[PDB]
């Protein structure tokens, strides 16, 4: 009856399933695999990623310029799944920094920028490379 009660239940169930190597759905599997890849990336390349992330000085007037520039660097030489994971982790750090800095309004804009870049610039490579389903076979932990 209340959509939100159903979404709370589905979120919790998806979580407990993931903790045992199971997935609510294929999309839930892709989400969890990306979360974990982001954490792995962040841990393995902390030093380098801290260095580059700290070079950024976020403002509302320049946040898009910065996003655009990093992402084009990241994908200058083409696309891998590693670069894709880093792209997400980058977006996540930009959001956290924006919040830390009282620029919450950027979070929603960053999300949009990411979704656009993914839809317009990564989706063709993704799909030619066996889709997110393959990302999950390669890098997910799940029982699959």
């Amino acid at each position: 009856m209340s959509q939100s009660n159903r979404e709370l239940v589905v979120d919790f169930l998806s979580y407990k399933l993931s903790q045992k190597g199971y997935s609510w759905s294929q999309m839930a599997a892709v989400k969890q695999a990306l979360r974990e890849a982001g954490d792995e990336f962040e841990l393995r390349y902390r030093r380098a990623f801290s260095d580059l992330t700290s070079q950024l000085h976020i403002t509302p007037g320049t946040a898009y310029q910065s996003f655009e520039q990093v992402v084009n660097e990241l994908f200058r030489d083409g696309v891998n799944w590693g670069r894709i994971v880093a792209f997400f982790s980058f977006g996540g750090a930009l959001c956290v920094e924006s919040v830390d800095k009282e620029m919450q309004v950027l979070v929603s804009r960053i999300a949009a920028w990411m979704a656009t870049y993914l839809n317009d610039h990564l989706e063709p490579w993704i799909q030619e490379n066996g889709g997110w389903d393959t990302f999950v076979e390669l890098y997910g932990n799940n029982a699959a």
């Binding site: 393995r44 390349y45 260095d51 990241l74 670069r83 994971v85 390669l138």
Partner: peptide, 16 residues
């Protein structure tokens, strides 16, 4: 100019 480099340097543990 290191985001280029990072992109070439990153590896993930992989299921083999």
């Amino acid at each position: 100019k290191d985001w280029e480099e990072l992109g070439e340097e990153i590896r993930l543990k992989v299921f083999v």
